[PDB]
Design a protein around this motif. Structure first.
Motif, short mmCIF file in Angstrom:
data_model
loop_
_atom_site.label_atom_id
_atom_site.label_comp_id
_atom_site.label_asym_id
_atom_site.label_seq_id
_atom_site.Cartn_x
_atom_site.Cartn_y
_atom_site.Cartn_z
N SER A 1 -0.03 4.15 -6.11
CA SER A 1 1.05 4.03 -7.09
C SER A 1 1.04 2.65 -7.74
O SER A 1 1.20 2.52 -8.96
CB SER A 1 2.39 4.31 -6.43
N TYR B 1 -2.41 6.27 6.18
CA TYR B 1 -2.34 6.82 4.83
C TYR B 1 -1.16 6.31 4.01
O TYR B 1 -1.27 6.23 2.78
CB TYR B 1 -2.34 8.36 4.88
N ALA C 1 -6.18 7.83 0.98
CA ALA C 1 -4.93 8.33 1.54
C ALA C 1 -5.00 9.84 1.76
O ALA C 1 -4.46 10.35 2.75
CB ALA C 1 -3.77 7.97 0.63
N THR C 2 -5.63 10.56 0.84
CA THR C 2 -5.78 12.00 1.00
C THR C 2 -6.63 12.32 2.22
O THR C 2 -6.30 13.22 3.00
CB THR C 2 -6.42 12.60 -0.25
N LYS D 1 -4.82 11.68 5.68
CA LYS D 1 -3.73 12.57 6.05
C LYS D 1 -4.18 14.02 6.19
O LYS D 1 -3.83 14.69 7.17
CB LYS D 1 -2.60 12.49 5.03
N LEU E 1 -6.27 6.28 -3.64
CA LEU E 1 -5.73 7.64 -3.73
C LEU E 1 -6.56 8.60 -2.89
O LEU E 1 -6.02 9.43 -2.16
CB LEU E 1 -5.68 8.09 -5.18
N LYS F 1 -1.33 5.18 0.14
CA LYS F 1 -0.46 5.87 -0.80
C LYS F 1 0.26 4.88 -1.71
O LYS F 1 0.33 5.08 -2.93
CB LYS F 1 0.56 6.73 -0.05
#
Lengths: 257, 56, 257
Positions: free
Chosen positions: A197, A189, A230-231, A234, A227, A193
């Motif tokens: 960004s 993740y 990654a959510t 994790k 995005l 992440k």
């Protein structure tokens, strides 16, 4: 199991026929022994780039640069920790106002921030050199070995982490994408992440500079994809966090009903 | 790259879009000016010796 | 069926009398065996250009140049594809703005364009050499052979395509008119597509420089002739496209009511 314990890419030393072939070539090279020979045509000597000796030598040079870059990062945190310790332990006989303490504090933050960026930039040069050393290993077979993939991810990870601190986000996108194509790094993740960004920065720049609409959407779509990934990696799918991100992405993106 | 105005490795050159950056660039130009001055000195020194030799 | 499989124009080796005639002539040439003889009057030796040996040597020369020119074009497309691949795969550690990507791409499109124009010129010299060899085959019988028309069309086709990329449009017209006189090449729509553009270029120049009205109408009429024909070959008569072109052509040209 540590792939960098021996500090080598592939251990170089079996067939009776092969042992005979190696014998006759060594005899031939003894006849034409001439250390002053320099090949006018570079094509033949360039075949040495495919050898195991060349790959090991390039691997160790990249290892040397990688260790130096990590030493740069680690020594800086040791210095920052020591610097803060020394500042708090020295006597301030001419400080009696609250705004004076705020003023003294801000200088220490400026000193620390200045040194951190210098360490990040110094370490980034080592990692960029380490990256270049691995790129000239032209043998695909030696690139699939666990030792190579171990060092390649570590060099990429540190370079990505450092370059983000220098606020050079768009440069981390090409390196991050090559990072998640090696072994199972795609399931990390932190990798997704950073891409969230970095692609958000690209989306703002197109919006700010009024660039093409196509690039605006592509940076937006790539931002949402990583995005959400990654959510999921994790907090898990169908989790309270995951439901929050889906509502955000659907609101942000354009859909047709 | 040789005057210190550009990284020889990453190839990024100096920028003045930040006030904090610009302060550090002032020092960079001082070293850049020193390198050119040291170079012009050696060239002039060669010219002086060559001028003497031609007369000799 | 490949007419260039054997790499020869006509196979050179029956009559009992003819076999006897050739034998006595071979005997006469033995008596006057003089390798150092040079004819003061070239008329007799020039008759060698009507032989089968002469044509076979010329055909291989034209074939040799044609392959070099075609190989020249094909090696370039390999280079361009390889060059684009290598540029996209190398790392841009100092490229963080969209305009930097635009500028880097513009540099590459110049390098690619430079080599393509260089490659087209190299091949065009070869194709012109191939054309020169075929025009000095003076035997009309050997010029009708399927091997000859096969190579003649391929050489003309490769030359015309190279010449158009160099923007030498008015030079393609004489060659294109020779191309559509070989076998059923006239029924190829690409042949009429190029003649449509090349005659349009000619009409513009006469209009631009205020050339003669006779040359203005001649190139205008020829432009409409080959534009309408190219539509018919690819889309068919009484098709919606063919209806479209007739309206355009009728509008442009001069008619009487």
């Amino acid at each position: 199991v540590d792939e960098l314990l021996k500090g080598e890419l592939v251990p170089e030393n079996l067939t009776e026929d092969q042992k005979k072939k190696k014998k006759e070539i060594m005899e031939q090279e003894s006849l034409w022994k001439n250390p002053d020979f320099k090949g006018y045509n570079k094509t033949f000597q360039e075949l040495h780039q495919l050898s195991k000796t060349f790959a090991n030598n390039q691997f160790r040079l990249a290892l040397s640069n990688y260790q130096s870059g990590v030493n740069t990062i680690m020594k800086n945190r040791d210095w920052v920790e020591q610097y803060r310790k020394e500042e708090a332990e020295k006597k301030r006989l001419d400080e009696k106002w609250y705004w004076q303490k705020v003023d003294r504090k801000a200088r220490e933050e400026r000193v620390v921030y200045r040194e951190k960026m210098k360490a990040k930039q110094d370490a980034l040069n080592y990692f960029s050199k380490a990256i270049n050393h691995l790129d000239e290993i032209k043998n695909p077979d030696l690139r699939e070995r666990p030792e190579f993939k171990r060092l390649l991810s570590d060099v990429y990870r540190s370079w990505i982490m450092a370059e983000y601190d220098l606020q050079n986000l768009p440069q981390t996108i090409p390196i991050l994408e090559l990072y998640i194509e090696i072994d199972d790094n795609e399931k990390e993740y932190p990798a997704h992440k950073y891409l969230a960004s970095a692609y958000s920065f690209e989306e703002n720049m197109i919006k700010k500079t009024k660039g093409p609409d196509d690039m605006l959407f592509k940076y937006r779509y790539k931002k949402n994809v990583h995005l959400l990934r990654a959510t999921e990696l994790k907090y898990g799918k169908d989790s309270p966090e995951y439901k929050h991100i889906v509502n955000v992405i659907n609101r942000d993106e354009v859909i047709s009903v | 790259a040789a005057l210190g105005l550009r990284n020889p490795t990453v190839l990024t050159f100096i920028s003045l879009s930040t006030a904090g950056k610009a302060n550090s660039v002032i020092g960079l130009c001082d070293d850049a000016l020193r390198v050119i001055s040291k170079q012009r000195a050696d060239l002039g020194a060669y010219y002086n010796r060559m001028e003497h030799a031609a007369k000799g």
